[PDB]
């Protein structure tokens with residue numbers, strides 16, 4: 001029952017890979033300790049292969065089957081539609097990996113006869129054959145981090161024609177089923193502001209609250225054949241078109257359960273018997289399985305009044321405390337149950353008695369004050385990885401602009417406002433690229449966003465207070481200041497000096513640029529302008545921004 005078997009063939013790159021931080025004329029204005037920033041490359045794929053390869057044993061008890069029966073009762077209320085080839089084509093990212101069969105992502109998006117004809121033949125083969133393993137490509141991800149070096153994470157994905165078929169069969173399922181099955185526990189239905197609100201209300205709902213985050217070691221590799229067949233039985237509870245039922249059974253048998261792994265040079269690398277990290281069902285499958293195992297583990301541990309918050313492989317549990325020592329024993333029982341379910345831990349879970357000390361989705365709740373002096377809870381994170389990635393993005397154009405995603409998701413934070421906004425608006429002004437749409441990812445889905453639209457996006461997700469927050473916590477200020485000294489980033493007083501210049505330069509341009517100056521940088525002036533709702537914000541189609549998670553799902557919105 002191994003997660004993977006290997007031939008010895010290498011996981012090969014597609015292009016030239018850079019590991020050392022690229023340096024340009026802008027680099028030093030952001031970060032001086034260049035040797036601390038690195039990117040992962042295929043050179044470390046061999047080490048990751050060793051980490052992800054292990055035997056999985058599963059012991060399933062009555063708590064497991066009880067929770068599964070409850071989940072299936074809710075899943076039976078879902079009605080899902082089959083997307084047309086055209087609808088599925090339009091969900092494809094413009095820079096999605098080209099097919100092996102003579103067409104790419106732009107051919108798909110343009111509904112080219114060749115792409116559409118190949119997608120129809122892949123679909124027909126899914127209906128007619130429910131046995132043949134489907135080919136997948138295995139790649140090493142190129143991701144940026146700060147030292148203290150991680151080996152490259154791996155991505156496993158089927159061909160472009162298969163990905164369009166996955167959308168046709170399961171896009172509606174993976175978008176609507178998780179919230180129906182898990183209700184308020186489904187994390188991807190919330191904006192960061194709604195996630196904060198859910199965490200605070202849950203913490204308050206408990207007489208003596210205790211909370212913990214549970215880190216499953218290499219989650220995708222812990223997902224067994226049973227787990228993948230169980231996820232399929234959940235999808236099959238939906239009211240579905242006969243062709244969708246057949247395609248879902250086919251995709252589960254031929255792709256989701258496992259299959260051969262091919263490198264970028266066409267060599268057989270081995271065989272996968274665990275979750276594929278680059279399929280449409282990665283996020284939904286991970287969320288459902290994590291929620292199932294954790295809800296059953298909570299019953300086995302006799303945890304009282306358990307509220308879960310699940311996002312793929314990320315899990316937060318808030319419950320009633322039995323006192324510090326009993327909570328510690330309780331958590332070891334929870335961990336034993338998770339382990340029997342084939343979800344052992346990385347770091348052992350730690351009981352927390354302060355909401356602000358729980359780290360989940362690399363984030364924590366913190367408090368600041370709005371213009372009226374009222375306490376405001378918001379989500380923040382250690383800014384090390386956002387800052388290492390901003391330094392890379394200062395000297396290189398990348399497919400996903402992490403700085404833009406981070407300003408969107410962490411707009412109320414002291415570090416996104418003072419550093420990211422200041423640095424990148426300065427760069428965009430110098431290149432007159434404020435109107436240029438840039439790609440970013442929100443809950444794994446790809447978006448093409450113009451930086452000029454940031455005031456309206458921030459207002460809609462976080463409210464006007466995101467432009468007024470002040471009197472940040474001593475703990476939060478200390479973590480930001482320590483991160484700056486560690487990376488060789490100029491102190492906050494420098495960013496404030498720079499922001500006044502960036503603000504003045506934006507206001508000069510007028511129009512949408514002046515709105516960016518006015519709203520994004522009001523924190524930088526001593527005589528603060530009165531901020532009122534932006535008329536353009538109501539018009540924004542913020543559609544399925546926070547409906548579901550799509551990590552590795554090849555989704556463009």
Ligand SMILES: COc1c(-c2nc3cc(NS(C)(=O)=O)ccc3o2)cc(-c2ccc[nH]c2=O)cc1C(C)(C)C
Pocket residue numbers: 187188191192195282283286287311312313314360361363379405406409441442443444549551
């Ligand atoms: C929900 O938490 C997130 C997530 C997020 N996506 C996750 C996906 C997984 N697992 S998987 C691969 O199986 O799907 C686990 C934890 C995750 O956290 C992403 C961003 C995020 C941050 C910056 C840019 N784009 C983003 O999507 C921001 C938040 C916050 C701010 C709400 C905490």
